Amino acid sequence: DISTEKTVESLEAIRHRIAQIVQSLTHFLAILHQSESLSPWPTIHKNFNILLSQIHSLSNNLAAHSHTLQTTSIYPSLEFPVKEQEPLLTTLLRTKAL
Amino acid sequence: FSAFPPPPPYYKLFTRENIEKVISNMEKEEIESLAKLFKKPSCLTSGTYQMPLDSQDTGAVSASSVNEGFRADQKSKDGETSDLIKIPRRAY
Amino acid sequence: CRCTQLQDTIDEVATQFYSSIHYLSSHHDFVPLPGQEKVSDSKVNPISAEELQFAQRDLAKDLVTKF
Amino acid sequence: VDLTSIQWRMPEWVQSMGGLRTENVLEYFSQSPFYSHKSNNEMLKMQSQFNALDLGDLNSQLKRLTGIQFVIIHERPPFLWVIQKQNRLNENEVKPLTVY
Amino acid sequence: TDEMKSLASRLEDTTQAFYDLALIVYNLEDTTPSDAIPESLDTLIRDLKSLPDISRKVNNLIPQDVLEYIEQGRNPDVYARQFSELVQKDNQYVNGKLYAIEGFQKAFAEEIKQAYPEVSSVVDKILNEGKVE
Amino acid sequence: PWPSEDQMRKTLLFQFSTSMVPNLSATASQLFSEQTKMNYPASPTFTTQE
Amino acid sequence: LLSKVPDDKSRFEIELEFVQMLSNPWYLNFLAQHKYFEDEAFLQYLEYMEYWREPEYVKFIIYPTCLHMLTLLKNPQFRNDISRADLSKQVNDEIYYEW
Amino acid sequence: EPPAIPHITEGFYPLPEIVETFSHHVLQELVSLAEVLPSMSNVEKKKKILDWLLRSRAFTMRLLVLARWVHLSPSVHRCIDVVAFLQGQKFCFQNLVHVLQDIRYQLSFARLRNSDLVTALDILSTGTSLRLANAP
Amino acid sequence: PEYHYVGSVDYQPTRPSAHQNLIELYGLTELAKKVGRVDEFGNKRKMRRSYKAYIQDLPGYNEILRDNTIKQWLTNPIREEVPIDIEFLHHVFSVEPGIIPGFNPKVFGLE
């Protein structure tokens, strides 16, 4: 069970990172929508940069906990079975590439 | 979750560059000849049905209990006795 | 028009063949002999004896009308 | 053949047998590309020819046996079941190779 | 059955040889004569020799599912019950299926007869050809 | 109405494609997956066949 | 620039079947999602599919829809909207009703 | 005479084979335990002898149960054969239904329907005029 | 004047008939007497779900266990005989009277 809790803290860290990048992407979206004409290249470019910093941090986390993340496997059960009737699960846990 | 086969690789082959190379071929008149062989639509006449050329035959599937033919501008009807019928021959 | 519909009617006849036999096999058959009738009520799904006779008479009538 | 992206089922099989059961979940699994025919459960199925069996026998003989085995990890009768491709070299200790 | 009786006699002899030897070794004391515990082991092995010959004498056949039942501790008499019961059950079942088609045919023949009287002779010849001489 | 999905599975274009492609491809894998007598004693439970 | 590796007879069996695929709307939707309409080579190959309207050739085609589908796809805005799922369902439902 | 009927030969273990392999296995297990014993503690010698004695006695008992049930073997076997037959009659009914369905399928495969000339003429001009006009 | 395929083949009825009472026919009635739910007098027949009825005769407290080994002893039957050296086993089986921990004689069921 020690391996399980190590995987717990690991996936906690990746969760935090992905949270932050969602916030930065939503912010970008807002600035884009703010002006009817497309926004000035300096600002959008600046935002591409911050986006880069986020995704770089994420790739580092994933490679650092790469062993513990490829040993663990995810299946839904027990409490999801109340909502189990839905295909939302298949869409949420799908790993088909775009 | 659902998926279908991709089209032929030679779709990916097309370019307006190679097209222009084959119109240059036309202007002149290996690679170019292979391109035009690729561009022709050589239909086929006979012999292949799978993924027939004519409809299915009853003699081909099992034994056929009767045969008949009617002449041009004439039909056959005769009077034979089961319930003493006098009516058309195919229908009987 | 006419020819295709009649074609449909003979097809209808074949369908009636196996449909009929299957219906009859599906529904109650237990016959006691000497002994007492006894059933696996679940798998059996019985139908009334009178219901049986009436249903097979009906089936005969339907088939003969088709012909 | 990439096994992970794909989503499989045979409703024809299920209707042939009828309802979705514990044992029919393992048979259903046997029909799927996920199952491997070299499996230990397949070797057992080959050894008994048209006779009754029992499920406690099934797990207890799974451990008795050494190799690749497919067991039920969690079971929920109405809709969903959980299977894993665990490999035990020895009894009482298993290394799960895949989950399903 | 005289042979069956000799076999189950030797079997009971055997399970009692086991029991006796396990007792002898559980309750072991100096007073116990050493010649008495190898004697018991002797009786045991020679029992297990007798078992194959007598077995060869019997010659009945056991259904697999019986062996399974005994295996799981289930009562084999339950098997015998299920099968006699099933004989009766399937008996009635099939018989009545045949009757169901019987009536179906008779209905069909009468309906044909009123519908197509000209072939009544044919249909009667059809019922007569199914039966025995 | 239009080409049968399984006919699509069997079409010669796909078989040609997957000949040139490794069987490792991911959308072809989804399509790929989509594609007696006994003397023994009967079971002592009564069975109505279906 | 890999050397072409085609077969003569096989590619008219195949081009027939491909036209058929074009009859299916869901195949068009996937096709659009995969951004095959981004490639100009594809569109030239479509015009090559115009050879299948010819009488001796069309005599072979099984599902008529494709032909119509093909003329439908000549509008690019239509291509981006068959990327859309809603319109896809509209098209499928439209055939289903004609059928 | 009683009417001939198929006799069911597989699914059955001769009682003599059962007792033979049982005797031989129990004896092997004794020989096998007889070598591990001289290498074991006296308390462990005893513990293992005991365990074998009792396990083998449980097996012998299973065979005693068998021996007693034996006298019903021929009756039960007769049942089995009767059921076999009756099952076969049911299989007959079902099998017929499946053959009738199959030939009905071949039937739909054999009919031919009057041509849709309309669609054919539209496709002369390379469109399905129907599907376009109809559809918004 | 004759329709085709009609009466083309003659057949006698099936040899055993379902309509016959087969329990009598193949002499299973004595079995049914012996195993049925109902006695021939009308009283009910009690049948243990286990085979305790035969363990009841035998000495000792005997638990009912499930072990498929005899089946396996039938899948992999052994050769005709095993070697047996009485003297060696006599030697091996002389054991010192000392006690054995962790083992109760409940299995013996003497009392």
XYZ file of C-alpha atoms in Angstrom, chain I residues 5-58:
54
model
C -43.441 -34.766 -53.546
C -46.618 -35.881 -51.715
C -46.161 -39.227 -49.978
C -42.839 -39.577 -51.781
C -41.289 -41.245 -48.711
C -43.022 -43.615 -46.324
C -41.941 -43.611 -42.695
C -42.875 -45.601 -39.694
C -43.388 -43.754 -36.408
C -40.427 -43.232 -34.103
C -39.443 -46.357 -32.253
C -39.933 -45.128 -28.662
C -42.872 -42.752 -28.442
C -43.102 -39.893 -25.999
C -46.786 -40.678 -25.509
C -45.849 -43.945 -23.811
C -45.093 -43.675 -20.103
C -41.355 -44.153 -20.325
C -40.851 -44.469 -16.554
C -42.668 -47.786 -16.670
C -41.275 -48.774 -20.046
C -37.622 -48.723 -19.005
C -38.297 -49.880 -15.465
C -37.424 -46.770 -13.545
C -40.542 -46.960 -11.398
C -38.661 -48.877 -8.709
C -36.065 -46.103 -8.774
C -38.772 -43.446 -8.411
C -40.158 -45.464 -5.504
C -36.686 -45.398 -3.989
C -35.676 -41.751 -4.532
C -38.822 -39.754 -5.253
C -40.020 -36.777 -3.245
C -43.120 -38.727 -2.205
C -43.173 -42.153 -0.594
C -45.388 -44.826 -2.119
C -47.424 -44.510 1.092
C -47.658 -40.748 0.548
C -45.221 -39.557 3.208
C -42.353 -37.243 2.331
C -38.801 -38.443 1.682
C -36.135 -36.453 3.483
C -32.777 -36.320 1.699
C -29.818 -34.508 3.232
C -28.261 -32.009 0.871
C -24.896 -33.441 1.956
C -23.953 -37.098 2.071
C -23.993 -37.031 5.884
C -26.268 -40.081 5.769
C -23.234 -42.262 5.092
C -20.765 -40.408 7.324
C -23.346 -41.002 10.048
C -22.377 -44.660 10.282
C -18.636 -44.109 10.612
